[PDB]
């Protein structure tokens, strides 16, 4: 069971910078084994290179509440009723940083929140046919009564409003499509599948 | 409760295509309302434009099984032990096509699967800080005993292997990180939250 081939079965011949700006787009040139027993020819794929992220689900296990952050995401505009989204605390991981240190820093900058205990949720590839981006989600213990107001770093044009909802309310917003970004959907579905055990662990 | 601002509260000044090849990278230039009042100055964001996708979770409600498709995703290479991933049937939506039309066509091309009934799962933004991509997931009724072999369009260098596993095994592979692409994580978490009702609905 499981996948068929490993890194022994693919060679990346070269990568070519197609675009270099804030982010990059790279042409990967590679060959790989085929399920029928042969080797492919040279394949090329355009890959959006934008680094990787840490994501924090801020969960108050005493109150059974979730902290959401609201901010504009212009890329949502063309397919959404509004480009302002309800999301998880999150940010890019820079060289030498840990997932958990980024999560804590962003929780303070984006929601004014201190974080207590943490546990991993899941680490996922956002859209691996066209981007390398991986996002690593943690759940962090918070006191949701301390989560309120307008945050974000103005010098980076980051304008963020905190919302506090019950867990059940956040999950219903997923089921209704009011929360519809991957990081939040994955985190809140995970929470709906693990909240009993997590609340026990964090309130004993 | 809910979001604060709408499309009336943002002005997209211009979009500039910075790169065009198979996909595009666009620079959005815009200004938007601020939570504390007033308007931002001009902000620019680089946005990866690659269209939008339909995703099909193939679920056999008689057997409580899912059909997975395996193929290489070279963008996974740098952060994964292998770039061959276990994934949902999925494909790009072309002009005029519906999510359902694409899901049914791809199920045949990628897994040799006829699909009976379908239902919506969720529609999500893959990573809206840097890409506009939206993926719309359906669950599709299949006979997993018909699922086997190698598929994909060899003329597009699409080499795909079918795997059939129990729902429980697929979900445990999500928990373990062996399935870690957003579309499959979201779909299989949804299935874990809804399978009892879905099996009752589809075996009446
Ligand atoms: C055709 O069914 C659209 O689906 P897709 O491109 O999402 O699926 P896939 O099978 O991932 O892609 C369909 C075809 O689109 C092209 N394609 C997909 N992703 C890329 C990429 N990153 N760069 C270049 N070409 C790509 C390839 O020709 C691929 O065979
Ligand atoms: O950390 P993050 O940039 O991912 O979080 P975000 O709040 O998405 O971004 C932090 C900062 O990085 C920059 N940034 C994020 N996404 C983009 C983008 N698509 N294009 C240009 N700059 C961006 C912005 O200055 C933003 O203030
Ligand atoms: Mg952020
Ligand atoms: Mg931030
Ligand atoms: Mg596909
Ligand atoms: Mg296909």
TrEMBL record, chains A, B:
It catalyses: ADP-D-ribose + H2O = D-ribose 5-phosphate + AMP + 2 H(+). Its cofactor is Mg(2+). One of its GO terms (molecular function) is ADP-ribose diphosphatase activity. Mg(2+) 1 binds at residues 90, 106, 110, 158. Keywords: Hydrolase, Magnesium, Metal-binding, Nucleotide-binding. GO terms for biological process: nucleoside phosphate metabolic process; ribose phosphate metabolic process. GO terms for cellular component: cytosol. Pfam families: NUDIX (PF00293). Its EC number is 3.6.1.13. SUPFAM superfamilies: Nudix. Mg(2+) 3 binds at residues 106, 110, 158. AMP binds at residues 46, 73, 129, 156. A motif (Nudix box) lies at residues 91-113. Mg(2+) 2 binds at residues 106, 110, 156. Gene3D superfamilies: Nucleoside Triphosphate Pyrophosphohydrolase. Belongs to the Nudix hydrolase family. NudF subfamily. Homodimer. Acts on ADP-mannose and ADP-glucose as well as ADP-ribose. Prevents glycogen biosynthesis. The reaction catalyzed by this enzyme is a limiting step of the gluconeogenic process. This is ADP-ribose pyrophosphatase. It comes from Klebsiella pneumoniae subsp. pneumoniae (strain HS11286).
């Amino acid at each position: 069971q499981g996948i068929t081939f490993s890194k022994n079965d693919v060679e990346i011949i070269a990568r070519e910078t197609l675009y270099r700006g804030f982010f990059s787009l790279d042409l990967y040139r590679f060959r790989h084994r085929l399920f029928n027993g042969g080797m492919s020819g040279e394949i090329t794929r355009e890959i959006f290179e934008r680094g990787h992220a840490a994501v924090l689900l801020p969960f108050d296990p005493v109150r059974d509440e979730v902290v959401l952050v609201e901010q504009i995401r212009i890329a949502a505009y063309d397919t959404s009723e509004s480009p302002w989204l309800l999301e998880m605390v999150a940010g890019m991981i820079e060289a030498g940083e840990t997932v958990e240190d980024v999560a804590r820093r962003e929780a303070l900058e984006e929601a004014g929140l201190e974080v207590g205990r943490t546990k991993p949720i899941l680490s996922y590839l956002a859209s691996p046919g066209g981007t390398s981006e991986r996002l690593s989600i943690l759940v962090g213990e918070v006191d949701a009564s301390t989560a309120k107001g307008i945050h974000g770093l103005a010098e980076e044009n980051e304008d963020i409003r905190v919302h506090v909802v019950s867990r059940e309310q956040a999950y219903q917003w997923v089921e209704e499509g009011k929360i519809d970004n991957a990081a939040s959907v994955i985190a809140l579905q995970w929470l709906q599948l693990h909240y009993h055990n997590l609340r026990n662990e964090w309130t004993k």
